[PDB]
Amino acid sequence: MASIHRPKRGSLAFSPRKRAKSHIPRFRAWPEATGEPKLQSFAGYKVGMTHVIMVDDTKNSLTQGMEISVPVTVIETPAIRVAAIRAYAEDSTGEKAIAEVWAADLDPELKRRIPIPAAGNQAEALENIGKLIEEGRVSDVRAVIYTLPKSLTGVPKKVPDIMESGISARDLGTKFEYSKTILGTLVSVTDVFKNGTLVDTAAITIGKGTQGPVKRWGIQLMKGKHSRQGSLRQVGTLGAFNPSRVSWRVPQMGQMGYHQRTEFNKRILKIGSDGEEVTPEGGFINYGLVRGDYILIKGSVPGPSKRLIRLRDPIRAKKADLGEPNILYISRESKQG
Amino acid sequence: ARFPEAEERLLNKKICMKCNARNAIRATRCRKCGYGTLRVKSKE
Amino acid sequence: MEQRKCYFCGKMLEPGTGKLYVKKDGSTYFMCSSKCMSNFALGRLPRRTEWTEKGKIQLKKA
Amino acid sequence: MKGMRSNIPRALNAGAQIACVDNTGAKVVEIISVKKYRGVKNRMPCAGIGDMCVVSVKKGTPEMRKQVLLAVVVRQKQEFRRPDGLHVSFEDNAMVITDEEGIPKGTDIKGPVAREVAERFPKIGTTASIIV
Amino acid sequence: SIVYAHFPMQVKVDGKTLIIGNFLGEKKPRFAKIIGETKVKVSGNDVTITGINKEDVGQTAANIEQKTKIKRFDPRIFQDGIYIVQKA
Amino acid sequence: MGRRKKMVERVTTLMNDPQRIRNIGIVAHIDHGKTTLSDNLLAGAGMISKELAGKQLFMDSDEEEQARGITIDSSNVSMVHTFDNEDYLINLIDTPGHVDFGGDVTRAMRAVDGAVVVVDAVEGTMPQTETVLRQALREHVRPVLFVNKVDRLINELQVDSQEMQIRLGKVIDHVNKLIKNMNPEKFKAGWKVDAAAGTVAFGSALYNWAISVPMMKKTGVSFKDVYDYCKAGDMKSLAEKCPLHEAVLDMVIHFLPNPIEAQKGRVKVIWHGDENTEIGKAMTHANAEGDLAFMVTDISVDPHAGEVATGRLFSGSLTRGMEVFTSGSARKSRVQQVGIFMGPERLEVDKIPAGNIAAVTGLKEAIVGSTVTTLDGMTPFESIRHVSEPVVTVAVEAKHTKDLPKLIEVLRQVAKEDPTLQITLDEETGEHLMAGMGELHLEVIAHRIERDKNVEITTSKPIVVYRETIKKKTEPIEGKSPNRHNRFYIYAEPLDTEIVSAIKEGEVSMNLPELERRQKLIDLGMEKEEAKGIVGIFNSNIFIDMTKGIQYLNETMELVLDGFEEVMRAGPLTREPVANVKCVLVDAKLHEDAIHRGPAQIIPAARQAIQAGMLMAEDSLLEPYQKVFVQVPQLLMGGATKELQGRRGIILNMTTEGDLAIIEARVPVAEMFGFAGEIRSATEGRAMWSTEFGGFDVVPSSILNDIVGQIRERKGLKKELPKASDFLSM
Predict the structure, then answer these.
(1) Residues with Cβ < 8 Å from F204, sequence gap 6 or more?
(2) Cβ within 8 Å, pair D85-A69
(3) Residue A98: which H helix or E strand, with range?
(4) Cα separations (Å) of F521 from F501, F516, F594?
(5) Count of other CB atoms within 10 angstroms of residue F207
(6) Torsion of CA F568, F571, F572, F573, to 10 degrees
(7) How does it assemble (chain D)?
(8) Measured between beta carbons, which residues in chain F are less than 8 angstroms from residue D32?
């Protein structure tokens, strides 16, 4: 038999396609430190999409210098609290948590997530971590941070979300000093990301529940006469006669969406403080209006509205210093029109 | 032009007549396959 | 930023939205929405359609 | 080829009988294949504005008819977006006979051409009376 | 020795590598790695490679000669490159 | 008085100013912006208002030339440069720098007195370069080297000032070697060159900087400095104070010989006539005289202008209203446009005595390579003919049935490109009989097809066509009528060679005084009676009406004639065109009434008879020859010649001059295939052949049977033919 070839339906790069074990994306890698100390990640909540008219500043592009309409995602980004500093020791079996110091004073609504750590050992915990770093038991340092969604109104929840973030510094001592400076403080998104820079966005995608292989993997439907013989939206064959089993690579029904996904190289087009600049007439549908500080991300982002979106400094960015975008018009017309 | 010192390194080797591998100018046998006949690389 | 007027309802095309429709004779018409495009393609005239500015002008002519 | 500023959906697939709108003697040409287009299994060859297709002259003069020629689509009813966010659509689909290089066999083009084709092939623009 | 027909090789030393720019008209220079404490000198149209390790000197010369390989054309017409005239 | 507005004025009288006149050419290689520096000599250097000067490469009369690094054809202009406070007329007549260009190159060099050299940096004396130096040597056109854009050697390759110009010092030495080895005598006779002495310049045409020891010194920026400045990167600012044009001009005035000197030089070698008549004297020893001694170099034209046939006024004067003959006939036309190639065109005027150019118009029937002069041109330069046609073509096909439509345009159009390609384009099966007579002709168009339009077609093998003819005087054959009422006793016989040549030239015309024609014929040899009875001629065959008495005959002449014509299109032996055959109607016997005299009865009889006649008259066949001018390197002769002779090629001239053995042999096209092919081995890869229709001769009798046999089957004809009696079926 002389066969016609096709690329495989869907990607096996995301198998098993199960539901994410948490509603928060977890970062498995952190990029290289390339400058002054700072947090490598922030976290906001997706609001919705709008579009801007901007001058194409992208170097070498055909439309560079002319007016272009660019879709943007609005992400409401209230200040996060640096709740703790955690130290990690590297050994043959990998990284292990070795120490943690919690900030002396923490927000009372953190009790919705965890019983509040007391204002106990912070000075001596920090000196213990300093001794550990001096004696070489510490491989690196991360900052445990959490969001404060109570200030938002389109997100109904008041329980904070907690996550670890890397610190970008040239040396472990510099990392520890910066973490001590930022410990217990409220960091704004301008203290993590700058306008016009590329970032990576992680989020839990839109949940679709249980979906068939046609929607879930993009398999072809039965065609022509076969379309009305009783197996229309349904895979042609589960396998060969031998091997006597259904491969895991055969497209099948199952959970669709509500997965963790990372998008790369999303450009920040605006860091705003007043949500009236971006909120349309009538508000964002099912969300409301922006009230705190916000961010405009060029293009689309994984997740629906109100989903927690984690932003991190780019890990596979190609282009060098991009610049500050020239946003000439932010559309606030009614999205419900 | 053609430079003799470049020609010494580029064109002054033997070629195995079964696998085409280059061999030393003094080699009587291919190193890759051990063939006993080797021709000089055709420089014309 | 080109400022464009809807041919049917006479409303300004908001930037990044709207349509331009070209007939065989080179005639160009800006449409603010699918509603205006559909009403233009139905043969309805703006001056007879009341919710458009041309219909409003025709009515206020009296 | 040179990139266009607009995003063009490949609207016309193989078998479409398009009106030919130059003075070459071809009235209707059927798309046979699309140049520089590699497909996938079961997918018909697809062409939008700015694409060059191999066509067969179905109506027209006896010299044009049954000939395998090259044509460039200059008008398409499927809407395409300009870089600045405005969507453009024509009242009909229309093509013009050209060579491999992009030169039109005709001398005048009745009807408006798309600015995308007018820029990708500058001679189509000069041959056309108006570029929209 | 340095030999070329039409394009003058720009050969220099930038530390532990040898930069070979304009090799056959290329816009990207070739990089030849230096081995050990091997001193390479570009004395006009020739290169001298002095060292205390015969392994290192021979490998530096081999690196130069292989970086200056014309991996496409007929070697009987295209002979541009840097070739060892005396081994260690 | 806007620039050229002033020039016009000066020019109109400058005509009779040989002292300052500078009609010269430019010879070298290609891809060196040679025709572009010459664009900038005057057009570039704004010899007219800048807006109307060299803005859009218009300088050259043959506008299309544009710029490829060398002349395209032989276009013309003028530039009045100032040198040591004096406005010399440097009529730029840049000569074609190629090799294929031939019998026309001769006169395209005669248009000037010095072809000039241009060789970009380390390009050197390329094969072509030396080829044009060889051609130059013929027309006594002294050269000056102009090593263009040395930038390569400089900025790009960076060869230190001294070295840089030492490489050229040698190149100059090679140009001397050229003018030594090739023609040793030539050297001392001004042809010698040298940067030092000033007869050699250099400089980037594209950057317009340029210098030469004279220039160098005068400007104060010696070549060393210039190198430093180029290298640096300021070649444009260099150009500014070292104007590309300037240098060239400067040299044309000073170093480059002023026309006058070698005004003679060319003529003798180039002219095949009496170089001692008023005309001869003037053309040689710089003078005017010679009753309008214009030379149609290239029959040209221009929209609402005139037949601007080029011809620098090497002797005579111009005026509007001169009944000028031609080197083909005595046309005699009003010469309104006796102007001078000026600005970026040919400023039409009148008063132009000998000195500058002299492109005369008012014509429409001469030939590119004539010598139109009021004077009764006894032996003008290229006294030649043109009567010829390709006879060994092919059958252009179509590898893909989808390109046929295109192919159709491609081929039908090609006529425009080249009318020498008589594209016998059949229509049914479509075996397109694309013209040709030899392998050259074949590939000649090959590429053209797959380049000026690009098509997926191919070709077949040489169509070995010829011209049918006979060789023996026959005995009256009777050609009866279908309805066995009429009869015609016609005889046939060889057409005398003198007569043949006569009508091959064409002079013997139907539209011609009987009495007159008659004499000519008798002159040739045909007796009075026979010579007077001549009714008509087709191709190169004559029908003679040497009958007396038959009533109602000339009212039938029509029919009988046509009959003849028909046969002349299709041989009775090989069904091939007939040529050089004389047919003579002796008697006849037509029916009284007209009813029994219709074409259907007459035409057969005639055809029948004529044909049979031919058959019986030992009908053979002719074959085209093609004079192989083969410029094999002097040394090489043994092999060169051996090749030709072996291919049954009746050796002609060996042409051994300096280092050039041009062995013509009018090689029979029969075996004139793969000349270059053979050459590459015979003469170790060193020979430059070129061919030209040598003429129709007799196919070797020995091989007749074979030839015929082949032809017969190739067309698709019965092996044997209707031997006499049968075709003459009574």
Answers:
(1) F148, F149, F150, F151, F210, F230, F235, F239, F244
(2) yes
(3) strand A94-102
(4) 12, 9, 34
(5) 21
(6) 150
(7) Part of the 50S ribosomal subunit. Forms a cluster with proteins L3 and L24e, part of which may contact the 16S rRNA in 2 intersubunit bridges.
(8) none
